Point group: D2
Chain length 466, copies 4
C-alpha cells in the first residue's frame, strides 16, 4: 500500500501514509466527525460547522511537514521515517480526547460535574489513543512499517500529554526537538495552533495574520542548554508576537464571544440537569453518566454532540428541565448580556470564588428587585497561553550570520508597543430575566457592583447607568 | 426594530430583517443545523461539514439582493418591502423540507421505503413552512410588518414548489418576475444555485466559475410574451453556459462521487433495516418511523442526521443489522464498486424504473449465485437541469442599446464549442457482499447485463 | 448611468458617470504607472499593484460608507451631491503621489529640495485642481447638481484638511451637522478611514500577508451621533477591540513590508539614482517650459508626466551623462545592493525629528572607532512605529454608541478594553546602510556604527 | 549557499536554488517586471497589474514541484538534481522572449511591422536565454552546481521551443523523454505554464481560485507509451483535464479576448507602428534599432518593455505626434470603435482590412473609408491544438495497473463535451470615431459579410 490523498480546503491535497489511514478508519477517530470545533460558536458564526475530525487531519499533516522540513534541512539530526510517522500519529491523535462541544466539556461541564477530578482533553486523548490502538489491531500494523510499539506508543503519548534531567522515555535528549512539534509545552508554538488559525478563519469569516508555512521554512534545530531544540529565525520574532495577537483576537471575537459563551453555558446547564438520567453503555455493558463516561473509553467513544439532540428530542419527564433549557436555545430565549468589566488588581479571581459572584452582584444596592439566581457571572481568563508568562521569552532564535548559535530576544528588543502584561481576566454578566424592566435593573446592579469592587468602568456605564 | 447582522464566510456581513430572524429562531428552521449539505460527501471531502442551515441563510440573502437590485433599478415595477420580505422568506425556507443527509433522503430512502408516495424535499419545505408559521405565531408578526398572510403565504409556497392562463394566486402577472428568483421553474437559474456553488466550492476546495453578484447587477425586467420576466444582458450568455458547466463539474467531482454515493447507499440501507424499530415522537406523543415522519411535521422536525448516530450508538439487538452497516462505514469496509456503463445520450431510464434494476442485473445469466438484494444500481444523470432541453433557450436577454426589448440567443450564436447534447445518463453498480468470490461474480452479472441491455464499457 | 468595474478586492463596483469622467483623464490614469509599494515590488513579487486600482477601491468604499449612513439615517439629509463629493475625494486622495509612492515625498524631495515643504496630499489637491480645470470637469459637476465652489473646497478639505485659526468649526465646504462626511476619506481626527481599509485588503491580497480587520463590518455598525455639537460617525462600543486590531494590522504591514529592510534600501538606491539624474532628465511642463524631476512638483502639467517610467528611462538610457544614475539601477538588477550595517533597538517616542534626519550620516561618519568613510557613504534610515498620531492613542479620539442608547455618544478608555494593550503608542529605530559594498568598507562601516551607537547611548547590533 | 525564499501570493513561500537566483538577478530576467501579463487587459480589469516576472517565478516553481514529485514517486527514473535544475531553469525562462504587452507584441505588432519575418516569443526566449547566460558568466556557475552546459543549455532550449534542427532531441535521451512534458508540452499543451497563469490571472482578475493543478501533480506517473517514457495522468482525472481547457476558454472569452481589451491592444499596436521609425533602441556595439528590429539583437531587446508606451505618451517630439495622439485617446477613453462581429488562415489576416474597404455597399454614405481606417480581428477559440482534441493526446493509467498506459476517448467521458474543438469569429473596428465614419464602417462591414458569405 501507498498513500491516500485527501483534499482539504485549508491545506489542499494531503498525502496520508497507510498506517495513518488505518488509524483514522476507526470508531475512535471517526467519532471526531460529531464534535464541533467551536461548540456553541456555531450558534453565533454559521460558517463554524467544522468538526474536530478535519482539524485533526490538518494537525497530523502539518506535524509531518515540519518534521520532514527539519530532516531535509538537517540530515545530521538522523530523523527517521519511524520518527516522522510517530510525530504524525501524535498530531492526528492529540484531539482524540475532546468531548461534546470541545472546550465546553473540559472547560465547563466536567469542572462543575466532577469537581474532585482533574481531567483535561489531553488525558482523554491519551486514553482514547490506547483504546483505539488496542481495539483495532494497530500494533501489528505499526510493526509492519518499522515502528517499535513499546517505545513509540510511549513516545506518542508523551507528545500529547507530556512526561508520564531528561523526563521523557520515548525518545532521548538528542531527539528533544521532536517533542516541540505537536504540543509544545515550553511555549505553545505548535502545529495544532497553526491548523486551527487557518481553519477557524476560513470558516469564521476571518483571515489569520500568521503564516504557518513560513515558520516551517525558517525553523532550525540548534543546541540550547544541552538540548537540541527547534529555533526560529530572529526576523520571525515579530511574526510570533503577531501569532499570539491573532490567537487573542480569535478568543475575543469568537471563542469567548459573549453569546457563544452563554450558549455553551446553557448547554452545560442542560447536561448537568440530565447527568443523572442519561445512560451510556461502556465496557462489559456497564452504564455510565455523561460525567463518568470519561472513566471508560468504550463509553466515551459514544459521547459526542449527539447528547445535545438526545436531550432535545427526549420525552422522558425526568429530562424535562434539561430539555426546556435546550428548547430555549432554539427559540433564542437566551439569557441577556448585561456588561463586562475587569479587576484592576494584579490578583485574579480564583475558581472557588466564581460561585459567590452572582450573590455579590445581587447584593449591590444601586423598579424590580433581582436575586442571585437571576444573574450569571462568567469569569474569562485571556492570556498568551502560559498564564502570566510571555511565551516568546521561551523561544530560541538564530541569526543569519550565525545559524547554530541560539539566542534569546526580549520584548524590549522587538517593540515598545507590545503588551506590558500577558494575562488578564474579563468578567461578563448576564441576566436570566429578559424583559426590559429586568434588564434595566440588571444594568444598575452591574455598574454598582463594579464601583463597589473597584473594577473597571463598563464601556457603556454612562448610558446604561446614569 | 433593527436588523441582525450575521457574518457568513461566503457573503460577509448579512443584514436580516426582524421578521426573518423570527422565522429563523424556531425549532423548524434550526433543525437545518443538523442536516449536512452534501450528506455522505463529508465522508469523502472533509471540508464539507456545512449544513443546510447556513446555506439557507445564503439563499435568503441572495434572494433579497436580487429583488432589491431590481427595485432600485426599476421603480416602475412597484416592488414593495412586502415583496422583498416574501421573496427572502421563500429563499430562507426552500430548504426546510430536506431530510437526513439531504438528497439521500428524498433521492434514495423515501423512494425505497414508501414507493407509493410522491415526496420531494420541496413538498416537505411547504408543509414544514406551514407548520413553522402556525406553531410559532408568525402570522401576527407578518401582519405587523405589512404582509397579508393569506396571499403572502400562498405566494411563498408557490415560490418554492410552483403552482398549487396565469396559474399563480400569490402574485399577479405584473409581478411574474418575482417567481424567477428563488426556484426558477422555467430554466433553473436561481439564487439557490448561486449560494451552493460558492459555499460548496469554499468547503470542498473546488472553484466556482460563475459570478452571481455580476448576474444580479446586469439583471433587468422586460416584457416577454405579455409577462414581466427577469432578463440577462446579452453579453452574459457565455457566463450562463459556464454556470451550468460549473454545476456539472460539481456533480462529477463531488455530488455524484462514487464513494460519497456508496456511503449514502449504506446509510440508506441501514435506515431501511432500522425503520421498524426507531421511534420519533410527533404530535400528541404519537410515535413515527423514519419513513413516516414525513406525515407529521412535529416528528419531521426531529428527523435529522442524528438518526445515524442513534443507530450507531444503539444497544438494542433488533438494531444489530442496521448498526453493523454503519460500523462498516467507520472501518471503511464499504459496499464495493463493480462497474459503470459508458454514458449514453438518452436520459432513457426513468425514476420509476430504478427499483427494478437490481432484479434485472441478478437475472442476467453469465458464462456463487447473487440475489437482487446483493446489488445496488445507481442511475446517474448529467444534464443542464431540464432533461434534454437547453435551459439557455429559455432565457431572455436584452442589449445595451435597447434595454426594454427582450430577445432570444441561440446556441449557435454563442459558440460551436458548446454541447450538442444537454443530457446523458450513466449506470453504476455496486455489490453489498465484499468477499472476492462475490465480487468476481458481481462483475460477471454486470458485464452480461450490459450486453443484454445494449449498454457498454467496464 | 453606471459603469461597472470588476475589482478583485471588492468585486463588481458601480461608478457614477461623473466619476468615470474624472477617471478618464491623463491626471488620473497616471496612477497606473505608480506602484503602490514602490521598491516593495522588488521584495514581494506579488506587489505589482499601482495607485490607480487602490484609488478606485478608496472611492468605492467611501461611497459604501456614505450610502450606508444615509440609508440607516434619513434624518441626516445626506444628498447625492454629498455622496458624489465624498466618492470624488476618495478617488482623488492619491492623485499627488510621485514615482514609487512614498519614496518620492519621503526620500527624494527632502534630499533634492530641502527648502521646500511638500507632501503627496498637497500634490493631490494641486493635481485635482489641474485635472478639473484641464478637462472641463466643472461644467459636468454642475450638470449633476454639484455646486463647484462649495464642493471643490469640500473635496480638497476632505483630502488635506482645513485650508482656513482658533477655531471651533474650521471647515468651509460643509457645516458642523455634516461633520461626519469629513471622517470618511482622510480622517484627521484618528486616522480611521477608507484609505486604510482598501490598502489593508489590497496589500494583503498581493503581498500574501493577512488583514485582521474587516472594513465591511465597521460600515454596518457605523452610526452618526451628536458629539460636542458636531454630528460624528460613531462606532458600536463592542467594535473597539476591532479598532485596536486595525492599528495592529497596520503596524504588522509596516514591519513586514512597508519598512522591509531590503525594500527600503532599494527605495534608497532609486532615490540616489534620481538625485544623480535630476539635472539631465527634462520634463516638459506648461508652455513648453522644461522641469527637472525635483521641480516637476511646481507645475502639474509636468507632474502629470512624472511616474515610475523615470526609473526605466534612466535604466535604458545610453547618454553618458546618465551613466552614474544608470549604474545604480543596474546594481539593483544584479542584486548588488547598498549593504545593511545594523539597527538600534527601539526607543520610546519619536525623539528624532524629520529635520534632524539629514545630519545623521555626517554624525555616523564623525564617530571615531578605536580600530576611512565619508557621510555620503552612509545611509541612515529613521523608522517610526506608531498608531498614526505620534504619541497619542487614536482610540481616545473615537466616539462610540451602545445598543441600548444608539443616539448617545461615549468615550471608551484603553483600560476599559484590555490590559494587554500598549503602554506606549510611538517608537523609533535607526537603520544604517553603506553604499560601498567591498568587505573592507563594510567592516569599517560596522565599526563606525557601533561606535556611534555607544556615543549616542543607543543599543543593539 | 542556501536557498532564497520568496513569498508569492499564489504559491506561498517558494524556495529558489542559488543558481536560479543568479539567473533571475540579471537585466535579461528582471526585464520581465516591466511587461504586463495581460497587456491591454489591465485597462479593462484593474486588478491585472501583474507582470511576466512573477508569472515566470511561478512557472519555475511548479516545474520543480512536478519533476520532484516524479523523482520521489519513481526512483527508477533516475531523475537527478541536475535534471531538476534544468527543468526549473526552463520553466523560469520560457517567458523571457515576450515583448511589450506580451501577446500584443508577437500576436499583433511584429506581424504588421515585419510581415516577412517569422517570430514568436518562444524563439525570443531561446535567444534571450543565450544572451542572458553569455552576458552574465552563468556557464561557470552552472558547472559549479553540477550541470554540463553544452548538454544542459541545449536541453533547456529544447524544453522551451522544441527540437532545434527517431528521437529528435539532443539534450536528453529517450529514457528522460517525460522531462520534455513539464514546461512546454508540445504534444497536448498540458504544462506548468498554464497552471500558474490560471491561478494567477484568476487571483488578479477577480475570478475565483482552485487547487486542481497541485492535484494533477500528485496523480502524475511516468509510463512507457510507444517506447517512450511519458507522463501519464490517473484515469479519474480525465474530467479534470477537460475542465482545464474549459477554464482556459472561459478566460479567453472573458478576459484575454475581451472586446475592449483587444481594441486597446490594437490602439497600442497602432501607436507603436506610427512611432517605430522614431524611437531608437541602442543594441550591441552602439547600433541603433527600432521597436520592430530590436528582436534582431538581444542587447536591444533587453531594453524593450511596456516603458515604450510611456516614452511615446510623454514625448514632445513632433515626429511622434500621431503616435502620442492615439495613446492620449486611450487615456480619455475615446477608443477605436467596434463595428461588428461575424461567426480563416494566419497569412490571410493582413489582407482583411483591404478587403473590407474594397466592399462596395449599396447605401449612400457621407464618407469613403480606406484599409488603414479598419481593424479586423480574427479570434480563434480552441483547445490549444487548432482542430484537435488535446485529451486524445494524453496517456492515462489505472489504479490496478499503474504501469500500463491507456487512451480514453471523448465518448468514454461525456456526451456533453464539445463536438468541435476550434472555432473562429471576426471582429471589425474603425479608427475614425465620428458618427459619419461609423455609419459608413457598418455598411462596409455588412457588405463584406454578404460578399464573403457567413453573414
Ligand atoms: N472607462 C474606463 N473603464 C475602465 C477603466 N479601467 C477598467 N475599466 C473597465 O473597462 C470596461 C470597458 O471599457 P468601457 O469604457 O466601458 O468601453 P466600452 O464598453 O467600449 O464603451 P462604453 O460604451 O462607453 O461602455 C469598463 O466597463 C470598466 O469596467 C478606466 O480607467 N476607464
Ligand atoms: N534576489 C532577488 N530576490 C527577490 C527578487 N524579487 C523578490 N525577491 C525577494 O526579496 C528578498 C530580497 O533580499 P535579497 O536579494 O536576499 O537581499 P539581502 O537579504 O540583502 O541579500 P542576501 O544577503 O543575499 O539575502 C529575497 O529574500 C526574496 O524573497 C529578485 O528579483 N531577486
Ligand atoms: N476532481 C476533483 N477535484 C478536487 N477534489 C477531488 C476531485 N475528485 C475527488 N476529490 C477529492 C475527494 C477526496 O478528498 C480526494 C480524493 O478523491 P479521489 O481522488 O476521488 O480518490 P478515491 O480514493 O475516491 O479514488 P481511488 O481510490 O480510485 O484513487 O479528492
Ligand atoms: N470582530 C468580529 N469580526 C468578525 N465577525 C464577528 C466579530 N464579532 C462578531 N462577529 C460575528 C458573529 C456573528 O455572526 C455576527 C454578529 O456578531 P455580534 O456583532 O458579535 O452580535 P451580537 O448579537 O452578539 O451583539 P449585539 O446583539 O450586542 O449587537 O458577527
Ligand atoms: N464574465 C466576466 N466575469 C468577470 N468579470 C468580467 C466579465 N466580463 C467582463 N468582466 C470585467 C471587466 C470589467 O472590469 C468589468 C465590466 O466589463 P464588461 O461588462 O465586459 O465590458 P463593458 O461593461 O465595457 O461592456 P458594455 O459597455 O457593452 O456594457 O467586468
Ligand atoms: N513577515 C512576513 N510575512 C510574509 N512575508 C514576508 C515577511 N517578511 C518577508 N516576507 C516576504 C518578502 C519576500 O518575498 C520573502 C522573504 O523576505 P525575508 O524573509 O524578509 O528575506 P530577506 O532576504 O529580506 O532576509 P534574509 O536574507 O536576512 O533572510 O518573504
Ligand atoms: Mg480510494
Ligand atoms: Mg445580539
Ligand atoms: Mg462599457
Ligand atoms: Mg536575503
Amino acid at each position: 500500500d501507498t498513500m491516500k490523498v485527501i483534499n482539504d480546503p485549508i491545506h489542499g491535497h494531503i498525502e496520508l501514509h497507510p498506517l495513518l489511514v488505518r488509524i483514522i478508519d476507526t470508531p475512535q477517530f471517526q467519532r471526531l466527525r460529531y464534535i464541533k470545533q467551536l461548540g456553541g460558536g456555531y450558534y453565533v458564526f454559521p460558517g463554524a460547522s467544522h468538526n474536530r475530525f478535519e482539524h485533526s487531519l490538518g494537525v497530523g499533516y502539518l506535524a509531518g511537514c515540519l518534521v520532514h522540513a527539519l530532516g531535509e534541512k538537517q540530515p545530521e539530526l538522523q530523523i527517521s521515517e519511524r520518527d516522522v510517522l510517530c510525530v504524525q500519529i501524535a498530531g492526528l491523535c492529540r484531539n482524540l480526547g475532546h468531548g461534546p462541544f470541545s472546550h465546553m466539556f473540559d472547560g465547563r461541564f466536567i469542572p462543575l460535574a466532577r469537581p474532585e477530578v482533574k481531567w483535561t482533553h489531553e488525558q482523554g486523548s491519551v486514553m482514547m489513543f490506547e483504546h483505539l490502538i488496542n481495539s483495532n489491531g494497530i500494533k501489528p500494523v505499526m510493526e509492519q512499517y518499522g515502528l517499535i510499539p513499546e517505545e513509540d506508543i510511549c513516545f506518542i503519548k508523551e507528545q500529547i500529554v507530556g512526561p508520564l534531567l531528561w523526563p521523557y522515555k520515548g525518545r532521548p535528549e538528542n531527539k528533544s526537538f521532536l517533542y516541540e512539534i505537536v504540543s509544545n509545552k515550553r511555549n505553545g508554538i505548535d502545529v495544532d495552533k497553526w491548523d486551527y488559525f487557518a481553519r477557524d478563519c476560513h470558516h469564521l469569516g476571518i483571515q489569520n495574520n500568521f503564516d504557518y508555512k513560513r515558520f516551517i521554512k525558517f525553523a532550525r534545530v540548534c543546541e540550547v542548554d544541552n538540548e537540541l531544540r527547534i529555533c526560529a529565525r530572529d526576523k520571525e520574532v515579530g511574526n510570533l508576537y503577531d501569532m499570539f495577537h491573532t490567537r487573542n483576537s480569535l478568543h475575543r471575537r469568537a471563542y469567548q464571544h459573549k453569546v457563544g459563551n452563554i450558549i455553551d453555558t446553557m448547554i452545560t446547564d442542560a447536561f448537568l440537569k440530565a447527568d443523572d438520567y442519561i445512560e451510556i453503555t461502556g465496557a462489559g455493558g456497564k452504564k455510565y453518566r455523561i460525567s463518568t463516561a470519561i472513566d471508560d473509553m468504550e463509553a466515551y467513544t459514544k459521547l459526542t454532540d449527539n447528547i445535545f439532540l438526545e436531550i432535545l428530542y427526549s420525552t422522558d419527564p425526568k429530562l424535562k428541565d434539561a430539555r426546556e433549557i435546550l428548547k430555549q436555545i432554539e427559540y433564542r430565549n437566551l439569557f441577556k448580556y448585561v456588561g463586562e468589566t475587569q479587576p484592576t488588581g494584579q490578583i485574579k479571581i480564583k475558581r472557588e470564588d466564581y460561585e459567590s459572584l452572582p450573590k455579590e452582584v445581587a447584593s449591590a444596592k444601586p423598579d424590580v428587585k433581582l436575586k442571585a439566581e437571576d444573574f450569571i457571572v462568567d469569569v474569562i481568563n485571556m492570556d498568551y497561553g502560559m498564564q502570566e508568562k510571555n511565551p516568546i521569552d521561551h523561544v530560541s532564535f538564530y541569526c543569519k550570520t550565525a545559524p547554530n548559535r541560539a539566542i534569546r530576544i526580549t520584548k524590549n528588543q522587538v517593540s515598545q508597543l507590545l503588551p506590558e502584561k500577558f494575562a488578564e481576566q474579563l468578567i461578563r454578566v448576564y441576566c436570566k430575566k429578559v424583559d426590559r424592566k429586568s434588564l434595566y435593573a440588571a444594568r444598575q446592579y452591574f455598574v454598582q457592583w463594579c464601583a463597589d469592587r473597584n473594577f473597571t468602568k463598563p464601556q457603556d456605564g454612562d448610558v446604561i447607568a446614569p
